[PDB]
Amino acid sequence: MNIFEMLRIDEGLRLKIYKDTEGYYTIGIGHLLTKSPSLNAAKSELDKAIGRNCNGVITKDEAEKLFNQDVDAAVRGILRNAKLKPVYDSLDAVRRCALINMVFQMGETGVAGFTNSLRMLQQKRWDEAAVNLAKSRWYNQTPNRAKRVITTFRTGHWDAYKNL
C-alpha cells in the first residue's frame, strides 16, 4: 500500500462535480474546487484547473492528473512548514503517510493547529497521541476515515486499510 492507494480509499473517485462531506464543490479524488455556493463558481474553477471546457465533467485521466498535483503539493507543503517538517522528519514511512492524508484533507494550516498531538507524535507516544487526535471536530465529523488514520499512527502498519 502507498499514499496514492490509501487516499484513493479515503476519498473515492467521482467524475462529476459533487459536494464534500462539508457541502463543498469537489471533483475527482477529493479535489476541492471552491468553498462558494455556486455551481457556477465551481464550474469555472474546474475549467481553469483542467484547461478546457469541461461542463462539470472530467475523464479518469484528468482526475488522476489533479490527484498527482494534490499529493505533490501536500508533501511540499509539509516540507515548507515549520511546524510540520520536524514531525514528518521524525516519523517512519508508514506514519508519514498518515500525516500526508491529514494535510490533504484539512490543509497545512488545519493540521498545524493540532499542536498537542504533533508534540506527542514527535515523542513517539503513539497511544497518547491517538487518544488526543480523536478529541477533534475532524474525528466527530468523519469518524470512519479519522479512525483509519489514527490506527495508522497508532500501529505504524496498514491494517486499517486491509479491510478496505
* Annotated binding residue 4: no
Residue tagged active-site, from 11, 62, 70, 108: 11
Q: Is 117 annotated as a binding residue?
A: yes
Q: What is the DSSP string of the chain?
A: --HHHHHHHHH--EEEEEE-TTS-EEEETTEEEESSS-HHHHHHHHHHHHTS--TTB--HHHHHHHHHHHHHHHHHHHHH-TTTHHHHHHS-HHHHHHHHHHHHHHHHHHHHT-HHHHHHHHTT-HHHHHHHHTSSHHHHHSHHHHHHHHHHHHHSSSTHHHH-
Q: Has 81 been labeled as part of a binding site?
A: no
Q: Is 20 a known active-site residue?
A: yes
| 114 carries a ligand binding annotation | no
CA dihedral 96, 101, 102, 106 (to 10 degrees): 140
- Select which of 5, 20, 89, 159 is catalytic: 20
Q: Which residue positions form the known binding site? A: 32, 104, 117, 132
Catalytic residues: 11, 20
Q: Which residue positions form the known binding site for substrate? A: 32, 104, 117, 132
